[PDB]
């Protein structure tokens, strides 16, 4: 090492013009970013927008959790949005979820009933889904056989 100890710190100025080119008294002389930095490691970046190059991705790599908080809404756009979640996916809104567009579901993983499993005589409580005119979903109790979505009441407001 090559150590310097002082109450203020080192200061370097050019004698030709007598302007402090680099001072360690940060309070009096603010620090300007030196050219040539390839990477930066700051405690908090108060930026405004982060962009990649004209022909490169924007990789965001972490080791713990990533927390995203838009205080007036989070908007996502693109071509194919994917969520390769290894655990649970929990969409928890408070007014409505609008699953716009064509909806699909994997049949090979969902529990699909097989033909020849009438062993259970007890008619446990079950429901059949139903699609109202406006869009709301509602379930109806199943009692007998060969029944559909005929309901006297108005469930979807």
């Amino acid at each position: 090492k090559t150590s310097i100890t002082s109450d203020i710190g080192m200061q370097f100025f050019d004698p030709r013009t007598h302007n402090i080119l680099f001072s360690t008294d940060y309070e009096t002389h603010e620090f300007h970013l030196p050219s040539g930095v390839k990477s930066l490691n700051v405690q908090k970046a108060s930026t405004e927008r982060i962009t990649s190059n004209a022909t490169s991705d924007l990789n965001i790599k972490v080791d713990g959790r990533a927390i995203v908080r838009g205080n007036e809404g989070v908007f996502i756009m693109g071509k194919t949005i994917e969520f390769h979640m290894g655990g649970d996916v929990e969409l928890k809104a408070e007014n409505s979820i609008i699953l716009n567009g064509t909806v699909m579901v994997s049949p090979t993983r969902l529990p699909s009933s097989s033909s020849g499993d009438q062993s259970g005589s007890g008619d446990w409580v079950r429901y059949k889904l139903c699609m109202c005119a406006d869009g709301t979903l509602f379930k109806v109790q199943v009692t007998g056989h060969n029944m559909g979505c005929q309901v006297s009441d108005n469930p979807c407001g």
Binding site: K1, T2, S3, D7, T24, F31, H32, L33, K38, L40, N41, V42, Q43, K44, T47, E48, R49, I50, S52, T55, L58, A66, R69, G70, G73, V74, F75, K79, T80, I81, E82, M85, G86, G87, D88, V89, L91, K92, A93, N95, S96, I97, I98, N100, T102, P107, P111, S113, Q118, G120, R126, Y127, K128, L129, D134, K139, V142, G144, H145, N146
Partner: protein, 157 residues
């Protein structure tokens, strides 16, 4: 100056500057960048916090590529005062290899499902219908033939 490490510290001991082989540590309490057209960091940034100024909006955009985010321990998205919109064009995939999907909103709408068409004879493929168990777990059952959404054994609570 030569050697292996050059450092500057106060009398009590505090790294105000240290230019070793790996990195250049600077003890400034706040670094300010005054570029007008922006700054370019070829390699990366390393921060534990990103925070837009209290008059603008953060925008993580990639101009002509894809945006890939990695977070092994989990991802949380919050929008305290706005819709959590997610608009795509080709395919929106929600994956959960060994988990579940939960929708806890007060109501659910799907107002673009493909409307059916009347066919006298119809087709012979078993078009499953969707039915919900007591605890809210979905399942598929064979088309109208004898029994109903019953025949489920013990896979739901």
């Amino acid at each position: 100056a030569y050697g292996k490490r050059f450092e500057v510290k106060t009398v009590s001991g505090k790294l105000l500057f240290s230019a070793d082989d790996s990195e250049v540590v600077v003890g400034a309490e706040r670094l300010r960048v005054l570029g007008a057209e922006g700054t370019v960091f070829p390699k990366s940034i390393e921060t534990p916090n990103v925070r837009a100024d209290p008059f603008k909006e953060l925008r993580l955009e990639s101009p002509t590529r894809s945006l890939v985010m990695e977070a092994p321990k989990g991802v949380e998205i919050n929008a305290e005062a706005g819709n959590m919109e997610a608009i795509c064009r080709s395919e929106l995939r929600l994956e959960s290899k060994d988990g579940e999907i939960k929708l806890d909103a007060a109501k659910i709408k799907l107002p673009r499902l493909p409307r059916g068409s009347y066919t006298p004879t119809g087709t012979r493929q078993k078009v499953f219908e969707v039915c919900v168990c007591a605890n809210g777990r979905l399942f598929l059952s064979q088309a109208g033939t004898g029994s109903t959404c019953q025949i489920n054994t013990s896979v739901c609570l």
